[PDB]
Amino acid sequence: MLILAIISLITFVSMSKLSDNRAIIRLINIYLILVLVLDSFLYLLFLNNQTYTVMGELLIFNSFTFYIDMLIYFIMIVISSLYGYNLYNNNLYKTLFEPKKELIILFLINILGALLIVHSNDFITLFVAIELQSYSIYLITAIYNSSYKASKASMLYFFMGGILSILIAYSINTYYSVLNSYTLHSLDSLIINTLDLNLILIALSLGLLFKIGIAPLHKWLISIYENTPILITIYISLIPKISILSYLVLSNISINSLVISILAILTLLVGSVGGLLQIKIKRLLAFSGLTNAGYMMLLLLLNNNEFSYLYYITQYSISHLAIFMIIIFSIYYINYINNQYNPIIYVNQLKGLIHDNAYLVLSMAIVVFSFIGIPPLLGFFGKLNILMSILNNGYYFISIVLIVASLISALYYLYLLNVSIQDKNNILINSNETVSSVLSYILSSLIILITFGFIYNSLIIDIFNVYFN
């Protein structure tokens, strides 16, 4: 039903004016909500890990992928509410947070390309869908074209995505040159013994992984995440991560991988010690993505990782989405707005935040202790259930390096708190205009999932016991 949305939408956007664009996104927001509500019941198809293959050995549908599908729709309902709703009714925030005409077009085409990977069985479905989502990230980066940094970032992202698309294509055709086959379904655990498919499947994994931000090739993605504006970057950070990783976690082609294990160690090291002496908030906030994409590369080495993965996915997605939404709200309280596309940059700009909207600091605290892994919060059971899979399966040096990486990464997480709970000379006493009710309810909902979401751990596991076993 994304197809019908795109086909209806681009015809509808061709006829609307510029001033209509905002309200169009509101429509699409509600549309996606009634694809969650009125169409969820398809989970009843997937009892006892019954898997389907649709369109003839082409798309594989299990309930792992159904959950990834539902997660991607939920986060788009959020991101679409960020574009489609005003923050305040000022003359300021209309020229700072304003959608383009064709923005929601590229959004839905991107989600289409990201779903056709997690649902994918074939390799040409994999390649066409990676190409579709890669074009969409090209154009979502370059759509705010009256910005020097965003155009430079779109060009950088074009060439570095072109190399790692031709590396994937070379790995697919290298796999074809030794097996007249397109599926990893053909592998079926006898062939891997008598066939040297190490170097092929590992090179395929790498060419898929370097697009995430794994650490030998991590600098260019941190540059794109700092150069893009503040609304584009909470989408292009989240979507290729969860799409490409839930591809590679579903098909288990790097087990006992020594190369994935080196790159997981190297990722947890230079992500935690990378973002220490840094002063820009999107930088600081983009090396948090490097370490938390490091905790996934561990699970690639695993067999049977579908609990640790999915729980830590929706953990990172809610925590991610919430900490980006908080520093949208701190823009009213800063004393200095530069750079219209990216209005808050330096992390010392949110300094007096406890004396002006103290419960924004309560919100910020609750989400940032969840990144560290504090046990009343939902981030801790995510790190816990990763640890239960790492220690089960023989990765003992990986585990202590995970722990040292978590301890180093707590420093620049707590730097946000250190800066936020400080004295400020000039405090706000009263504000005329207040924040959007339907948009601040989303942040309150995203906290109450993080705070009081350890409640349902038991229920989820029992539901997890039925539909995946």
Partner: protein, 89 residues
């Protein structure tokens, strides 16, 4: 496999060690894609199937749309800055 691998590796190193302009980087990308095509088309001929030819005729179109998208990205890059640097972006 010699012609496709040699086109791919020489085009790849010409892309990497490009410091002189940017249109050499685009055309090194396209010559890479040609090399991956050549390797696959030979594997289709040697294995007696259209299967790799199916992936070939799809990746022809995807190389095309990659050119169209990325060269519009370059025109966007050039719009604000009336010259393209020699050292790169």
């Amino acid at each position: 496999m010699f012609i496709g691998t040699i086109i791919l590796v020489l085009s790849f190193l010409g892309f990497v060690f490009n410091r002189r302009n940017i249109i050499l980087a685009f055309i090194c990308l396209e010559t890479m894609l040609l090399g991956i095509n050549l390797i696959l088309l030979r594997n289709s001929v040697l294995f007696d199937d259209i299967s790799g030819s199916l992936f070939a005729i799809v990746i022809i179109i995807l190389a095309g749309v990659e050119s169209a998208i990325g060269l519009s990205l370059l025109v966007s890059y050039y719009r604000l800055r009336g010259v393209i640097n020699s050292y790169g972006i």
